[PDB]
Amino acid sequence: TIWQNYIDALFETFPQLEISEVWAKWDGGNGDAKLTANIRTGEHFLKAREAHIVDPNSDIYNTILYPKTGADLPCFGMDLMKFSDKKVIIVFDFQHPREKYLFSVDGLPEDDGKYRFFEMGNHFSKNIFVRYCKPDEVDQYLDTFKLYLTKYKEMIDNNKPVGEDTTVYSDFDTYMTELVRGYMKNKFGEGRSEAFVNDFLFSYK
Numbered sequence: 001t002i003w004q005n006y007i008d009a010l011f012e013t014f015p016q017l018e019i020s021e022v023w024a025k026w027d028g029g030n031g032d033a034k035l036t037a038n039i040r041t042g043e044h045f046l047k048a049r050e051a052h053i054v055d056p057n058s059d060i061y062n063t064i065l066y067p068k069t070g071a072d073l074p075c076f077g078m079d080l081m082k083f084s085d086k087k088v089i090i091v092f093d094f095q096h097p098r099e100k101y102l103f104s105v106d107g108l109p110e111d112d113g114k115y116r117f118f119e120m121g122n123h124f125s126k127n128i129f130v131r132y133c134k135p136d137e138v139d140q141y142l143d144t145f146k147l148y149l150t151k152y153k154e155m156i157d158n159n160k161p162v163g164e165d166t167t168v169y170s171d172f173d174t175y176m177t178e179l180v181r182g183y184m185k186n187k188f189g190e191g192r193s194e195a196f197v198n199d200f201l202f203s204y205k
Contacts, residue, residue: 001054002088002135003061003080005142013149014065014156016042023200028187029055035188037200044068044156046164049200055187057085059135064095066204067156069163074103074125075172076152078145082135083183089132090141091117092148094125097172102126105151109144123175166204173202 001007011017017040024037033055040048050063059082067073078092096103104110104126111120111128118124129148131141177197184193198205 001052001061002059002082002138003052005139006078006080006145007061009142009146009149010063013146013153014042014045014048017045017048017065018042020047023049024196026188026192028189028192031187032056033058033187035196037196044161046166046169049203051196051201053183053187058082058183060183062201065152066169067159068161069165069168071159071161071163072098073155073159073161075169076148080138082138086134087132088135088138089130090138091128091130092145093118093128094148094152095123095172096125097123097169099123099171099175105148105155108148108151123172169204173204177202177205 019038020041021039023039024035026035027033028035033053035053038050040050044067046066046068048063048065053060061080064075064077066075074094074096077095080090082088094103094105100122102121108127109129110126117130118128120126120128129144133140181193181197184196
């Protein structure tokens with residue numbers, strides 16, 4: 001995968017997040033598409049849920065860390081998406097569970113507001129990070145990603161949250177579910193795509 005350095009950085013920062021379930025291994029596409037879905041658990045987190053899909057023209061790593069509750073911490077989410085042979089979109093952010101709550105982190109870049117990608121202040125922070133690039137270029141943004149990870153580890157470590165109330169994340173998982181799902185439908189079928197979104201991606205609704 002073109003995302004190996006991101007994945008390595010994520011689990012260097014959070015070595016406690018160990019695979020607790022391999023939720024799915026699926027073939028799809030022409031199968032020439034392979035999907036891996038893992039649930040990871042470990043100190044300070046309810047779960048990290050990691051989706052990784054590859055085919056001849058795509059490489060998608062979609063992962064959200066859901067911290068334990070009661071410290072009002074955000075999730076950390078990323079959608080690292082090679083979607084064609086020559087194109088990638090990279091998105092990562094601190095995604096707060098509370099609707100309409102504006103979050104930010106001192107010392108991180110702030111989006112300039114030139115492009116309207118996501119609803120700022122509603123499960124996306126001032127520091128939303130969105131870039132398009134070539135597959136050949138994806139590590140240009142690795143250093144910035146590592147800085148985000150450093151700030152997230154600091155807030156997790158400072159707070160040591162212990163709550164296990166998954167309903168904290170209901171509004172967030174509903175919102176993300178509502179946010180065509182063309183890729184998944186085309187490759188794995190309408191049924192498996194629906195199960196993937198509801199039972200794995202956003203299962204706290």
